[PDB]
Design a protein around this ligand. Structure first.
Ligand SMILES: *[C@@H]1O[C@H](CO)[C@@H](O[C@@H]2O[C@H](CO)[C@@H](O[C@@H]3O[C@H](CO)[C@@H](O)[C@H](O)[C@@H]3O)[C@H](O)[C@H]2NC(C)=O)[C@H](O)[C@H]1NC(C)=O
Ligand SMILES: *[C@@H]1O[C@H](CO)[C@@H](O[C@@H]2O[C@H](CO)[C@@H](O)[C@H](O)[C@H]2NC(C)=O)[C@H](O)[C@H]1NC(C)=O
Ligand SMILES: *[C@@H]1O[C@H](CO)[C@@H](O[C@@H]2O[C@H](CO)[C@@H](O)[C@H](O)[C@H]2NC(C)=O)[C@H](O)[C@H]1NC(C)=O
Ligand SMILES: *[C@@H]1O[C@H](CO)[C@@H](O[C@@H]2O[C@H](CO)[C@@H](O)[C@H](O)[C@H]2NC(C)=O)[C@H](O)[C@H]1NC(C)=O
Ligand code: NAG
Ligand code: NAG
Ligand code: NAG
Ligand code: NAG
Ligand code: NAG
Lengths: 1274, 49
C-alpha cells in the first residue's frame, strides 16, 4: 500500500543545522516531498524541498531563521505532491535560540593582594568545537558587589581569549567572581578568593570509610602527611571525630555535635598513624546522618599546625540491605516470554553471592526463588499470558523482619526493587523487540544490538525483502541513520538479527535508538531504547614532563600530544596553592553539564500541546455481545508514544497512533613560586614540546594540566601530569604573612638532610639595616644531623624599616672531623651549600583609624565643584597614612536580580490578592526609571496587573470600601488600612493601566466618613495577619498612612479632609517629639514624608533633624532600625515588625529627603544617596524584601531617587581632580561604564584637593583616608 | 505595677475594685519574652508564670 513518512525533532534550534529524515515506501509514480515552516501570526515563511526515492531513508538538514522572541511556536506542514495522490499534515513545533556553552579557567583558585589575576574565557557549541563568538562584556565583581574591571564587546579568536587584571595593594579580603554576560544575557559566573595567608608545604592525607553501615562495632581510620616525592614529615597529630545529630534548631550555641571520641599520638617516619574506633559510643540512632573528621598534624621543629577537615563525607545509610534491576524490558508483548536481570547490594555497593531471593509477579504468578551467582546477581524469564499492565516486585533475604516502633527510633530499612512493564498495541499481531543493554557504553569502541522479529500473518503482500530502518538521537537532534533488508519466505515463524553501532562520541550521554518496519498493510511496528554513553571528548590529549625530580635545573620539557592542529591552553602551579583551595572542577564531566538539552524526551509539554486530531473513541458506546459495555479510557503503548518518548513528531500516512483522544644563572639562590607556567601553544602534526625553565622555590611537587581546541576533533582535556623537584640537602623557613614594625616576632629556619651520609652544619643569617636578628640559642656551634634528620633555629627578629623586607640565610655542610656520628662524610658532591632569600612584609605600629568623604556631585548640564581638605592628627606614624577616590552611577546592582522573581500571578482573597498585585505596580515603575526594561516583560506584567485589579474590585462594597474577605454574604465592614492601601496603589496603578476614577473617589469618600477631627483616622475592620503592614495599628501610624496615600493622590493641601488630617499630624509630632514615652521611629519616618509631601519645609526639617540625629550610620551606609531594647513581639510577627520596620521606614525617610517642593537641594540628595547604599545592600536574595509593605515603599523610594539622579540624553559626564601641588587625574562617566568603580590614589601628605564635575548625569565621589596612631596612658 | 522580692522571695499587694465581673490577674517576672528558637520543635524549657 502506498506509504510515506517524515520525522523531525519537536524542538528545532534556530541557526543550528537541524536534521530531519524522510521515508517514502511504495511506488506509484515519482513524488516530491516538501516541509514548510511558517509563523502562527504574521508573514514569516520557509520551504525545504526534500528528495525521496522508493523504499529508502534519505535525510536532510537545515538552519532555521532567528526569532526576536526567545522561544516562538510555529506551524510546520509537510506536503507530498504527486500526479496520482497528494497528502499533507500540520502540527505545532517550538523553535528556540539555544545559546552557546562557555567557561573561564583562572591561573589560581586563590590570590594574595597585589598579585595579578589571569584567566581565560572560551565558548563552544552543542558539538564541543571552538566557536568565535562576540561576547559583549566580562567583568570582575568584588565581594561587596562593585564591578572593579571590565572588557567590553570582543570576539574570541581561537574559540578563546586570555585576560589579566592587577589586584590592588589594599583590596577587600573575601570572595570575588568574574562574570560573562553573553549577547542573550546568560551570565556565566566563576569565583576566586583573595586573602592574606602563607602557603602550606605539606598535605594532610585523611582516610575514612566513604559510606559506613549502621550495624557496626568499629571502623578503621588513618591520617598521613607528605609534600614532595612522598617524603613524610614527623609530627604530634591530634585527630577527632564528632557526630552532629539531625537537629532542626540552633539557639546561640548551635553545636549539633555530641559524642566525641578524640585521639592523640605521634607520626612514624616512612609512614603515618593508624587507629580503629568503636562506633557503639556514637549510638547512631534518633536522627544521625553526617559527621566531620578534623585533624591536626603539628609538624615538629616548626610551630606549624596545619589541620585538614577531610572526609566530612562519611555516611550512615538506612538502606543497609538493597536490590536493584540491571537489564529488564520496560516494553513487552504477550507473544514472547519477557526476560529481566536483578543485582544484590549491601549498603556500600557490595554484591553478595550464594544468598536466596524471592521474585514475585502480580500477574503470571511467577513467585519463584533463586540464588545469587558470583557478583551477587540473578537473571530470569517469565511466561506472557495476561492483560496488558504487569507489576513485578523482588524481595530478598530479610523480606519482612523487625517492625520496631519507629516513633523515637531508626526505621531499620531495606530497599526493594520493583517495575511495571506494559505491552505494545500490535496491529497485525506481528512486532519488533529491541534487546536492552543498559550500562555505560564506552566510546571509541563499537557495540552491537540484538533485534528480535515475529511475522504471524505479517507478510500479507508476500514480498521477498522487508526494509527495517533505525535512527539514533542525542542532544535533542537526530545524529545517525541507516537501514537493513531482512528477506522472508512465507509465514516467518521467528528469528534473531543484530545491528552494529560504533560508540563514536558524536552521541552525548543519552543515546535514544529506535527501529521500525514498514508493512504494505499500512502498519508500522518498532521499538525504542535508551543507552547511557560515557561522557567523553573527541580531541584525545595527554600531558607529561621530560625530566622529573632535578632541583633548580634549567630547560625541562613539557609535552602535549593532541589533534594535528590545535590551540592548547597549559596551566602549571605549585601543589601548595592547589593544596590550599582546590581549583574549580574542570573535567569532561564539567563540560557535559554545561551543555543545554542533554536529552530531549517528550515534546515541549508546558508551552506547546500538539496532542490532537480526532475523537472516534466515544463514537462507539455500544455492546460486546453477552452483556452491554459502554466505552472508557486506556493505558496501552503505541508507535506514537515511542516517537514522543524520543522527542520527535511524525507526519505520516500509516497507522501509528492508538484510537482514543477525549481522555487526558644564580649560583644557589631561591625565589619565585606562585604560578609556574600559564600559556598556550599550537600542536604540529602529532604533538608539541614546551621547554619551560625550572623554578627554584621547589620545595613541593609541580602539578600541571591543560586543554585543547581543534576545528575537527572538538575540544580535549589532559590528565594532570606532575613534576617533583627535590634538592637532597635544603633549608626551609617558618614565618608569617605580615608583621608589625615595632613589635618583635619569631622567625625560624629548618635545615634538612635526606642524603644517606651524615653532615654537620652552620646557620648563617646575614643581617641588613632593615632589622635585628637575635638568636634564641646563643651557641652557633654546628650540630650533626643524619639521613631523615633536621635541626631548627629560632631568631628573635624585630623589623626597623617598613614595607617589603628580603631576608638572607645560608647553610653549609661542614667537613669537621672528630664527629658525634659514627662516620664523618659531611662533604657531599655540589649540594654542599644552599642560600635562601624569602621576603615577608611589615606593617606600621599602633592602632589604625579611617575617615570617609562621600559626595554626590551632579552637574546640571554645566559644572559643579567641591573642595576636599585632608587633615591628619599629630600622632600619625610616619608613612602610615594613605588615601584614594572612587567614581560611578551605582543604582544598577539590586536592579540585576530583583527584577526577575517579582511580578507573580494574582490569586486569593482581598488580602492575599493585594500582596501579589501591589508590588507589580512599583516594580513596573522602578524598571521604567532605571531605563532597564523590555516589552516582553511589560506585556507579561500588564496581564498580572489588569487581572489583579479586576480580581481586587471583586472584594469591594457598595460604600466603596474593601474587606479581607469581601462580600460572599457581605457580613463585613471594610478595614481602614486595606482601603487606604488599595487607594494608594490605585493612584499609582492608574499611570500605566488606565483605572476607573469612580473607585478612587468612592474609596476617598468612605475614608472621610471614618475621620475624626482629633485623632484624624479611626480603625475599622479586622485583619487575618499584621504582615501586610509596618503600621503599628496606632491612630497616629494609620492616619500617617492615609495622609500619605491622600497627598500621593494628587489632592490640594486646602482640602477639608487633609486640613483636618494635617491638623492632627502637627499635634502628633509636637507631642511625639516632646514625650519620649509615646513614639519612637516608625512614626517619625512616616511624619517626615507626609510633611515633605504636604509642603511644610520648616516642620519637615524640624522632624528630619531629630531623625537624622537618631539615625544609625555604618560603613558609609546610613539607615534606621526599631530600637530592640523595650520588648520583642509575637513569634510569628517578630521579623516583619522590626527588620521590615527597618527596611520600609528607611525608604520612607528617603522619599521625604527626595520630596522638596522647588527641587531637592544638593545637601538633600547627597544624604539621600547614602540611604540608597543601605537599602540596595539590604535586599532579599530571590528578589524584593522581608514583608510586603516594605517591598512596595523600597521600590517606590528607589524609583523616585532613580528619576532624580539618572539622565536619558546625558551621555557625557566629565570629572577632574587636582591638588594645590601639581597633582592631576581625570575620568569619563558615560552610558556604559556608569556600572564600574573607577578608582585612583592620592599622593599628598597635607591634602588640598578640588573635585570638578561637568556635563550631565550624576557621579558619586567616595574618598577614604586611612592612617595609624599610637598614643597610650597605661 | 512592679515590686521587688523581699527576704524569702515574696511580694504582697492590693488593687482597686472598680470594673466589670470576672477579673484576670497574671504575674510575669524577670524575662517573660526570650528566644528559645521555636515553641514545640526539639526542646522547651519554659519558665512558668
Ligand atoms: C517611564 O519611562 C518613559 C520612557 O519610556 C518616561 O517618559 C519620558 O519622560 C521624559 C520626561 O521625564 C520625556 O521628555 C520630554 O518629552 C517631551 C515630548 O513628549 C518633550 O517636549 C520634552 O522636551 C521632554 O524631552 C520623554 O520624552 C518621555 N519618553 C521617552 C520615550 O523617553 C517616563 O517619564 C517614565 N515614567 C513614568 C512614570 O512613566
Ligand atoms: C508457558 O507458555 C506456554 C506457551 O507455549 C504454555 O503452553 C500452553 O499451555 C496450554 C495449557 O495451559 C496448552 O493448552 C497449550 O497447548 C500449550 N502450548 C504449547 C505450545 O505447549 C504453558 O502452559 C505456559 N506455562 C506457564 C506455567 O505459564
Ligand atoms: C629583594 O631582593 C631581590 C633579589 O635581588 C629583589 O628582586 C629582584 O632582583 C632582580 C635583580 O636582578 C631585579 O632585576 C628584579 O627587578 C627584582 N624584583 C622586583 C620585583 O623588582 C627584590 O626587589 C628585593 N626587594 C626589595 C624591596 O628591594
Ligand atoms: C517600677 O515602677 C516605678 C514607678 O511606677 C518606676 O519608677 C520610676 O523609674 C524611673 C527610672 O526608670 C525614675 O526616674 C522615676 O523617678 C521612677 N518613679 C516614677 C513614679 O516614675 C520603675 O521604673 C519601675 N521599674 C522598672 C523595672 O521599670
Ligand atoms: C496508485 O495509487 C492510486 C490510489 O491508491 C491507485 O488508483 C493506483 O492503482 C495505484 N497504482 C498505480 C500503478 O498507479
Ligand atoms: C508577505 O505577504 C505577501 C502578501 O500580502 C506575500 O506576497 C509575501 O510572499 C509575504 N512575504 C514573505 C517573505 O513570505
Ligand atoms: C580493618 O582492620 C582490620 C584489622 O584491625 C583488618 O582485618 C581489615 O582487613 C581492615 N579493613 C579493610 C577493609 O581493609
Ligand atoms: C525454591 O524453589 C524450589 C522449587 O519450587 C523449592 O524446592 C525450594 O524449597 C525453594 N526454596 C526455598 C528457600 O523455599
Ligand atoms: C484606688 O486605691 C488605691 C489604693 O492603693 C489608690 O492609690 C488609688 O488612688 C485609688 N483610685 C481610685 C480610682 O479610687
Amino acid at each position: 500500500k502506498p506509504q510515506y513518512m517524515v520525522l523531525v525533532p519537536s524542538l528545532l534550534h534556530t541557526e543550528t543545522t537541524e536534521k530531519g529524515c524522510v521515508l517514502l515506501s511504495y511506488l506509484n509514480e515519482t513524488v516530491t516531498v516538501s516541509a514548510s515552516l511558517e509563523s502562527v501570526r504574521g508573514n514569516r515563511s520557509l520551504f525545504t524541498d526534500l528528495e525521496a526515492e522508493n523504499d529508502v531513508l534519505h535525510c536532510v538538514a537545515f538552519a532555521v531563521p532567528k526569532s526576536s522572541s526567545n522561544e516562538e511556536v510555529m506551524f510546520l506542514t509537510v506536503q507530498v505532491k504527486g500526479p496520482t495522490q497528494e497528502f499533507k499534515k500540520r502540527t505545532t513545533v517550538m523553535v528556540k535560540n539555544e545559546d552557546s556553552l562557555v567557561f573561564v579557567q583562572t591561573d589560581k583558585s586563590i590570590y594574595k593582594p597585589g598579585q595579578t589575576v589571569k584567566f581565560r574565557v572560551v565558548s563552544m557549541d552543542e558539538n564541543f568545537h571552538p566557536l568565535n563568538e562576540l561576547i559583549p562584556l566580562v567583568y570582575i565583581q568584588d565581594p561587596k558587589g562593585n564591578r572593579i574591571a571590565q572588557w567590553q564587546s570582543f570576539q574570541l579568536e581561537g574559540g578563546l581569549k586570555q585576560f589579566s587584571f592587577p589586584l590592588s595593594s589594599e583590596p577587600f579580603q573575601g570572595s570575588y567572581k568574574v562574570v560573562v554576560q553573553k549577547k542573550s544575557g546568560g551570565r556565566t559566573e566563576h569565583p576566586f578568593t583573595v586573602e592574606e595567608f602563607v602557603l602550606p608545604k605539606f598535605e594532610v592525607q585523611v582516610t575514612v570509610p566513604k559510606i559506613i553501615t549502621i550495624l557496626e562495632e568499629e571502623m578503621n581510620v588513618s591520617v598521613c602527611g607528605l609534600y614532595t616525592y612522598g617524603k613524610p614529615v614527623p609530627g604530634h597529630v591530634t585527630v577527632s571525630i564528632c557526630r552532629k545529630y539531625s537537629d532542626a534548631s540552633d539557639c546561640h550555641g548551635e553545636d549539633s555535635q555530641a559524642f566525641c571520641e578524640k585521639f592523640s599520638g605521634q607520626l612514624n617516619s616512612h609512614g603515618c598513624f593508624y587507629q580503629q574506633v568503636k562506633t557503639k559510643v556514637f549510638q547512631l540512632k534518633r536522627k544521625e546522618y553526617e559527621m566531620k573528621l578534623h585533624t591536626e598534624a603539628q609538624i615538629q621543629e616548626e610551630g606549624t599546625v596545619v589541620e585538614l577537615t577531610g572526609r566530612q563525607s562519611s555516611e550512615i545509610t538506612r538502606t543497609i540491605t538493597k536490590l536493584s534491576f540491571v537489564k529488564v524490558d520496560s516494553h513487552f508483548r504477550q507473544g514472547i516470554p519477557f526476560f529481566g536481570q536483578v543485582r544484590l547490594v549491601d549498603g556500600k555497593g557490595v554484591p553478595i553471592p550464594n544468598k536466596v531471593i524471592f521474585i514475585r509477579g502480580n500477574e503470571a504468578n511467577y513467585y519463584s526463588n533463586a540464588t545469587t551467582d558470583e557478583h551477587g546477581l540473578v537473571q530470569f524469564s517469565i511466561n506472557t499470558t495476561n492483560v496488558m499492565g504487569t507489576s513485578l516486585t523482588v524481595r530478598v533475604n530479610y523480606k519482612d523482619r523487625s517492625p520496631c516502633y519507629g516513633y523515637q527510633w531508626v526505621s531499620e530499612e531495606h530497599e526493594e526493587a520493583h517495575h511495571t512493564a506494559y505491552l505494545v498495541f500490535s496491529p497485525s499481531k506481528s512486532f519488533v523487540h529491541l534487546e536492552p543493554m543498559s550500562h555505560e557504553l564506552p566510546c571509541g569502541h563499537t557495540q552491537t544490538v540484538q533485534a528480535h522479529y515475529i511475522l504471524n500473518g505479517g507478510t500479507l503482500l508476500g514480498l521477498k525483502k522487508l526494509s527495517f530502518y533505525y535512527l539514533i538521537m542525542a542532544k535533542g537532534g537526530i545524529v545517525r541513520t541507516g537501514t537493513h533488508g531482512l528477506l522472508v519466505k512465507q509465514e516467518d515463524m521467528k528469528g534473531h538479527f543484530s545491528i552494529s553501532i560504533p560508540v563514536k562520541s558524536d552521541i552525548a550521554p543519552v543515546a535514544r535508538l529506535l527501529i521500525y518496519a514498514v508493512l504494505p498493510t499500512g502498519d508500522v511496528i518498532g521499538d525504542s531504547a535508551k543507552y547511557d554513553v560515557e561522557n567523553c571528548l573527541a580531541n584525545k590529549v595527554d600531558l607529561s614532563f621530560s625530566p622529573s625530580q632535578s632541583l633548580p635545573a634549567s630547560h625541562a620539557h613539557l609535552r602535549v600530544t593532541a589533534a594535528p592542529q590545535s590551540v592548547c591552553a597549559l596551566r602549571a602551579v605549585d601543589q601548595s596553592v592547589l593544596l590550599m583551595k582546590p581549583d574549580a572542577e574542570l573535567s569532561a564531566s564539567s563540560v557535559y553539564n554545561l551543555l543545554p538539552e542533554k536529552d530531549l524526551t517528550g515534546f515541549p509539554g508546558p508551552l506547546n500541546d500538539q496532542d490532537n486530531e480526532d475523537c472516534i473513541n466515544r463514537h462507539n458506546v455500544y455492546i460486546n455481545g453477552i452483556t452491554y459495555t459502554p466505552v472508557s479510557s486506556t493505558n496501552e503503548k503505541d508507535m506514537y508514544s515511542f516517537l514522543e518518548d524520543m522527542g520527535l513528531k511524525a507526519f505520516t500516512n500509516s497507522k501509528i497512533r492508538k484510537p482514543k483522544m477525549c481522555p487526558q644563572t644564580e649560583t644557589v639562590r631561591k625565589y619565585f613560586p606562585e604560578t609556574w607556567i600559564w600559556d598556550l601553544v599550537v600542536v604540529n602534526s602529532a604533538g608539541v614540546a614546551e621547554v619551560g625553565v625550572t623554578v627554584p622555590d621547589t620545595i613541593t611537587e609541580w602539578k600541571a594540566g591543560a586543554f585543547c581546541l581543534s576545528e575537527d576533533a572538538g575540544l580535549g582535556i589532559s590528565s594532570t601530569a606532575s613534576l617533583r623537584a627535590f634538592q637532597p640537602f635544603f633549608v626551609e623557613l617558618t614565618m608569617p604573612y605580615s608583621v608589625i614594625r615595632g613589635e618583635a616576632f619569631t622567625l625560624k629556619a629548618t635545615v634538612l638532610n635526606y642524603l644517606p651520609k651524615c653532615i654537620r652544619v652552620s646557620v648563617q643569617l646575614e643581617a641588613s639595616p632593615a632589622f635585628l636578628a637575635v638568636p634564641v640559642e646563643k651557641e652557633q656551634a654546628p650540630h650533626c644531623i643524619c639521613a631523615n634528620g633536621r635541626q631548627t633555629v629560632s631568631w628573635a627578629v624585630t623589623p626597623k624599616s617598613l614595607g617589603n623586607v628580603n631576608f638572607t640565610v645560608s647553610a653549609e655542610a661542614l667537613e669537621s672531623q672528630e664527629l658525634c656520628g659514627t662516620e664523618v662524610p659531611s662533604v657531599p658532591e655540589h649540594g654542599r651549600k644552599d642560600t635562601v632569600i624569602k621576603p615577608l612584609l611589615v606593617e606600621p605600629e599602633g592602632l589604625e583609624k579611617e575617615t570617609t568623604f562621600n559626595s554626590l556631585l551632579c552637574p546640571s548640564g554645566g559644572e559643579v565643584s567641591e573642595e576636599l581638605s585632608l587633615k591628619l592628627p599629630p600622632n600619625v606614624v610616619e608613612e602610615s597614612a594613605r588615601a584614594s577616590v572612587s567614581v560611578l552611577g551605582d543604582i544598577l546592582g539590586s536592579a540585576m536580580q530583583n527584577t526577575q522573581n517579582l511580578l507573580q500571578m494574582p490569586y486569593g482573597c482581598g488580602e492575599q490578592n493585594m500582596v501579589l498585585f501591589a508590588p507589580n505596580i512599583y516594580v513596573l515603575d522602578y524598571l521604567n526609571e532605571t531605563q532597564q526594561l523590555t516589552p516582553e516583560i511589560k506585556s507579561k506584567a500588564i496581564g498580572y496587573l489588569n487581572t489583579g485589579y479586576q480580581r481586587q474590585l471583586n472584594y469591594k462594597h457598595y460604600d466603596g470600601s474593601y474587606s479581607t474577605f469581601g462580600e460572599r454574604y457581605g457580613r463585613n465592614q471594610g478595614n481602614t488600612w486595606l482601603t487606604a492601601f488599595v487607594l494608594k496603589t490605585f493612584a499609582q496603578a492608574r499611570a500605566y493601566i488606565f483605572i476607573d476614577e469612580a473607585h478612587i473617589t468612592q474609596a476617598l469618600i468612605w475614608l472621610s466618613q471614618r475621620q475624626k477631627d482629633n485623632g484624624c483616622f479611626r480603625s475599622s475592620g479586622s485583619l487575618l495577619n499584621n504582615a501586610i503592614k509596618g503600621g503599628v495599628e496606632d491612630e497616629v501610624t494609620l492616619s500617617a498612612y492615609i495622609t500619605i496615600a491622600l497627598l500621593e493622590i494628587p489632592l490640594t493641601v486646602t482640602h477639608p479632609v487633609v486640613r483636618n488630617a494635617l491638623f492632627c499630624l502637627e499635634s502628633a509630632w509636637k507631642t511625639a517629639q516632646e514625650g519620649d514615652h509615646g513614639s519612637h521611629v516608625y512614626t517619625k519616618a512616616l511624619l517626615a514624608y507626609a510633611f515633605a509631601l504636604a509642603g511644610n519645609q520648616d516642620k519637615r526639617k524640624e522632624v528630619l533633624k531629630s531623625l537624622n540625629e537618631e539615625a544609625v550610620k555604618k560603613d558609609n551606609s546610613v539607615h534606621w532600625e526599631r530600637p530592640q531594647k523595650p520588648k520583642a513581639p509575637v513569634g510569628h510577627f517578630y521579623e516583619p515588625q522590626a527588620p521590615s520596620a527597618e527596611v520600609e521606614m528607611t525608604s520612607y525617610v528617603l522619599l521625604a529627603y527626595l520630596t522638596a517642593q522647588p527641587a531637592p537641594t544638593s545637601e538633600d540628595l547627597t544624604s539621600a544617596t547614602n540611604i540608597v547604599k543601605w537599602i540596595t545592600k539590604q535586599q532579599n536574595a530571590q528578589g524584593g524584601f522581608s514583608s510586603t509593605q516594605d517591598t512596595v515603599v523600597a521600590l517606590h523610594a528607589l524609583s523616585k531617587y532613580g528619576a532624580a539622579t539618572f539622565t536619558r540624553t546625558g551621555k557625557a559626564a566629565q570629572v577632574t581632580i587636582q591638588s594645590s601641588g601639581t597633582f592631576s587625574s581625570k575620568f569619563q562617566v558615560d552610558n556604559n561604564n556608569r556600572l564600574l568603580l573607577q578608582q585612583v590614589s592620592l599622593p599628598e601628605l597635607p591634602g588640598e584637593y578640588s573635585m570638578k564635575v561637568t556635563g550631565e548625569g550624576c557621579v558619586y565621589l567616595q574618598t577614604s583616608l586611612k592612617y595609624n596612631i599610637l598614643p597610650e596612658k597605661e
